[PDB]
Symmetry: C3
Subunit: 484 residues, 3 copies
């Protein structure tokens, strides 16, 4: 005598945020922000150099903790906390512009320069750079006088680039503890070290003075560096206090460099590296670390953003889900939408296939659109272990904190618009399934108001099956149902 | 005999911009861009130091206009137009990196260094730094010779950091007017000032020469500064022309620094500061000043962006507001939607409560979403009064003029999408109120085409009240209204 | 006996991307990303200086390839590949901060300084700067000794700014090949060049040494530059090796500077300049060159983004286009929506004017909104021909590659939302045209299910015309059509 219709519901829903409400209960939802990392470095398919105690700048000068790393070759370069560049006390000049070159180099190739020295002692060593006894750096030479006070002749040496890749030359200038020991090593008079190339003329000078003792010594060595282009030349003229190189340095290819504190994993495989592990996920957004390098998801401020993947949960815009149909059915477990007739034969519930699959195919089309990959690869511009310069370091924090505010706005605006459209999408599929059964069942039944029809003739289980499969012929029943 | 329905309207509407039209008349609207500022500095709950004539860098050297500000402590630091750092003519080196430290410091703490000087005159004063007679800076010492030409012995002093906060040490180097007066103060020979720490070795040198007269004098003093870390040391060796410090400098906490031109207000309270006052508002966007610091609304290019908070105004997507209902009622003053019957009893207008409150509750849910607070605090990276460096100043203007173009695009796209959905929201509430009265009044009435029903029986004021309260029983009237 | 209705279709559609599907066939579409450039520089209405072999920094020193360009004046400045700044071998100091000043200057004005020199030879020339025989730069003076070895007196000169615009003064310092030729030109002793102003005290020094031969010579000239403010002064004291200026330099106005490789076109007119031509288009997005200057469209990563400007193509959300109306008509060529009756008179198709023009007027309102102009003018911050500094050059590439990712996200999100709304817009105009004909034709006809009505009386071509023009009086036909 009557044929009703409704939708499915579950007892425990999930609260998502829509464009016009907060906390809307929905049948099913999906997290869209990654929060769990793998506490390892996943490097399947990448040859990997773990430096350890070797600093990143010890591969171009060669302290005794960088003997096995002078001519490395890898695609992933991992620096550590304890990495030191020097053994005799000193530092570089413009050390952060040089580390950004060597992280993307993919290795380094050393070739000899070939300087010959005469009337001069070259094997002056130090007590700090110890391999077996006392030694010095592995690729440079401590040039000092032969007689302890007499003289140091003025020298002039030259080198010429012959390859097609740019070179990295590094030299050193020695600042003694006093003038009383600068004479004890070199001689007298002013000391000049003129460094000349096509684009370089600086003429450095030592500066003896009292210093606090860094690990036993009171002198310093400052290392400088320039870059040759092909078919160019370099000239070093000096009359004392010079730390001459022996080998040049070249590049190999492309790589990346990360700064980590965890181990190296050879079976796992991921391409998003931060200082605490590896972010391996397909989600577009993440809330783990804002300084991650590689192909990574974007950093948001919010920790949880749920995406609705079902209709609204109504347990027991178009006005069907909690419109005139006031509750959902918990017995309907086959699909999303269904029929429940009631006649002289008894009761019986079905489920509709063409309307359930018309709603699932549009929800899955939204999930394939959001689960996508970023093709943009981000490098590493700041240094975690030691302190880039203060004025440009405030520009980097200002820019990163402004792009984070933009992406965390596009995150919650995308989701709240995507759940507003999803709830309205499954609301329209119930209003089209109501109006198909209405205009099929033309003049033989009336409407109740609760989303249920009341048919004016004897329509048994064979007859009610003619309405579900869209084969109801109203013309056979027309002349009898107009009596009622 | 008939029962109509319509919506309310006002004579003077407001033109807003939608996603598909320009200038749509709506019942009520709301401005969403702030344009009025308070011409004061609102600082209730913040301890505040107004510097005035004291420069921001005079608190570490102590000219006579910074006597009361040597050991200040505040949370809001206000600099002025007339602030000068020095009294003897000179300047600093890297003066903009140092002002960015002191604005966020929250005060400064001076502790003594304790250098003793012997065989040497220390109380050399100048005629420009006048407190009572002639004096010098308040925390530094003018070291010069005792006999007017004879000699200046080579000196060496040292200091050691003992606290846990970093220090700010400042020294000075004196460049005389000539060599004839450099001998008249110090002696003869070359002058070296070697400054040594764990990370610093520079060995500065004076440079006598003719200068134009800045306020009476023709010499200069250049001030330099380094930062100690805890358990580190500094050594100053010199044989002349040195301006030695007496006290160190420490930090206290967290603050902000603004550059203003207006007064200080102690009763008002706001947290968005620009150079002309205080932006106090709840609106998300503002068009006052693009260089405001603190928790501020975002800067847009547009001066007016109206947000619709009512239905479309039709005076005398779903097709009800100016669809088949062609005009709005100006007599309906109770709610937004209503009924107006007409029968043998006369006339009478009502208003519907369940449909009016279903539209207001969704408009107010949009206003609570847009009226929100920014939690991100912006500092001050450029200097209005004096001229940051030209190459990095062009990077700051390029970045700020690109984020302004992004937010003024998200401003007018949010509003035009928000008014497109609002007009469609109040259009659907009229189509649901029409179709509820339709299927309630099942076979007893027909439709006109103007949104009005014409009932086929005698339905008086008691009977018409049964339709407004949703209690109309059609079964009692069915067998008589089918005669017509 | 029956009156149907449908929409128009074409055989070949166009596949666009919507918010919920990929590749949706639509009647007509529109490209929204520009890809074709004009391989010229369009400069109608702009006075234009093509430099050619003159470098941009040769207009302030005057080598012999910049004789006609010393006092230029233009609004568009075009540099070339072969532009060289110097004739004697050397370079500038901070050459990139100075080129950014001169590109926006709009010309340059030279005024004389007026130094007189006595007891000294001034006309020392070089063999590299050749105009007729041997000469030197056009606005500077090579000051050297009179007797080949004897002496060079110490000199002191001064200049004072008298205008209201800032000056550009440039001087030079000569670094000889050795000390044996520095004596052969100047004299003996140390050489100082003290440069003093209100904000400048540097006291430079020459540096003789062996250099590789750049085009015949082994010495260098380094050029330096400062800026005067009005009522300020400059003093040059020296005892040798100085390259003194003769004329100052001023600015004229506002301009832009491009770096191109193509010719200059005087009849074309465009305002977006890159290194390969001119982007002339009205489209908001472009995929030609990401380093374009002027009023340009924004750079996206995608090469094609089609915008739908018609309904969905169904050849032979509201459920009319491929809802219950299952195909489109290819005979309907007048408008977008129409009628096709069928009776005893025969057949006949019409087209509806009020529904076709109600859909076109809303599509055109979207095209006027997207085709708009950017008012923001972008300058040129990096240098294509020669290599800005490595650390700040990595900041510029990092920022540009992040704004490109934002705009190419707002590009495909705007289009996919704009085509989702367009298809739903022309779907609702068919559902309003179906329900207008329905409630007009009140109780005289029934519905089929295919979007066609079947009328219960004899309604000929004059009668069917009463339905298309909205003049059908159902009351005249009511008492006869209720018999059926
Ligand atoms: C609900 O969504 C989740 C995704 O979070 C999915 O794994 C699951 O299969 C869905 N269905 C049910 C019945 O949980
Ligand atoms: C930049 O922000 C980081 C926080 O990740 C902080 O450690 C660092 O000190 C900041 N740098 C500057 C110069 O403020
Ligand atoms: C209903 O449709 C199915 C499949 O189209 C068909 O097998 C069946 O005979 C139809 N009729 C009834 C009464 O089930
Ligand atoms: C209209 O909106 C304004 C907000 O601008 C509000 O103050 C006012 O109460 C609203 N109603 C009327 C009747 O003006
Ligand atoms: C940056 O823009 C401001 C405008 O607020 C201007 O005063 C300043 O001179 C600009 N700086 C540079 C280096 O162009
Ligand atoms: C209408 O509804 C109200 C409240 O539900 C009730 O008090 C009243 O009796 C109802 N009937 C009429 C005829 O007003
Ligand atoms: C289709 O759109 C294009 C724009 O690409 C327009 O030029 C054309 O006139 C439109 N109509 C037809 C029938 O091609
Ligand atoms: C910046 O990117 C450009 C690509 O247009 C490249 O030519 C240039 O070398 C890059 N600069 C640096 C410092 O990486
Ligand atoms: C239909 O409308 C047109 C214009 O409104 C009118 O000229 C015509 O007489 C009307 N009637 C018929 C039967 O065409």
């Amino acid at each position: 005598d009557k044929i009703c219709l409704g939708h499915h519901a579950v007892s425990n829903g999930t609260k998502v945020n829509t464009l016009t409400e907060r906390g809307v209960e929905v049948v099913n939802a999906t997290e869209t922000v990654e929060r769990t990392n793998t506490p390892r470095i996943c490097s399947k398919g990448k040859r990997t150099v773990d430096l350890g105690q070797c600093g990143l700048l010890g591969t171009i000068t060669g302290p005794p903790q960088c003997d096995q790393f002078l001519e490395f070759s890898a695609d992933l370069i991992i620096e550590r906390r304890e990495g030191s560049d020097v053994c005799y006390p000193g530092k570089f000049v413009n050390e952060e512009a040089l580390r950004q070159i060597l992280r993307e180099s993919g290795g380094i190739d050393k070739e000899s320069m070939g300087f010959t020295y005469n009337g001069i002692r070259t094997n002056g060593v130090t007590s700090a750079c110890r391999r077996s006894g006392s030694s010095f750096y592995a690729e440079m030479k401590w040039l000092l006088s032969n007689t302890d006070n007499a003289a140091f002749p003025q020298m002039t040496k030259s080198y010429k680039n012959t390859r097609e890749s740019p070179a990295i030359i590094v030299w050193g200038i020695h600042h003694s503890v006093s003038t009383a020991e600068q004479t004890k090593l070199y001689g007298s008079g002013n000391k000049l070290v003129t460094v000349g190339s096509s684009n370089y003329q600086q003429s450095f000078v030592p500066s003896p003075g009292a210093r606090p003792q860094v690990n036993g010594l009171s002198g310093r060595i400052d290392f400088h560096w320039l870059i040759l282009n092909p078919n160019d030349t370099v000239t070093f003229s000096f009359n004392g206090a010079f730390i001459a190189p022996d080998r040049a340095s070249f590049l190999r290819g492309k790589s990346m460099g990360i700064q980590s504190g965890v181990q190296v994993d050879a079976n796992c495989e991921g391409d998003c590296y931060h200082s605490g592990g590896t972010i391996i996920s397909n989600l577009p957004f993440q809330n783990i670390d804002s300084r991650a390098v590689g192909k990574c998801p974007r950093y948001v401020k919010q920790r949880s953003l749920l995406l609705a993947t079902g209709m609204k949960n109504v347990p027991e815009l178009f006005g069907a889900i909690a419109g005139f149909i006031e509750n959902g059915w918990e017995g309907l477990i086959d699909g999303w939408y269904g029929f429940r007739h009631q006649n002289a034969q008894g009761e019986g519930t079905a489920a509709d296939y063409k309307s359930t699959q018309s709603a699932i195919d549009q929800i899955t089309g939204k999930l394939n659109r959001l689960i996508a990959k970023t093709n943009q690869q981000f490098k590493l511009i700041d240094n975690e272990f030691n302190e880039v310069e203060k004025q440009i370091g405030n520009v980097i924090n200002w820019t990163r904190d402004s792009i984070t505010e933009v992406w965390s706005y596009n995150a919650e605006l995308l989701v709240a618009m995507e759940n507003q459209h999803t709830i309205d999408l499954a609301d329209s599929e119930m209003d089209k399934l109501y109006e198909r059964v209405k205009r099929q069942l033309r003049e033989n039944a009336e409407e109740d108001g609760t989303g249920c029809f009341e048919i004016f003739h004897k329509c048994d289980d064979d007859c009610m099956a003619s309405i579900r499969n869209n084969t109801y012929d109203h013309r056979k029943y027309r002349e009898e149902a107009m009596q009622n």
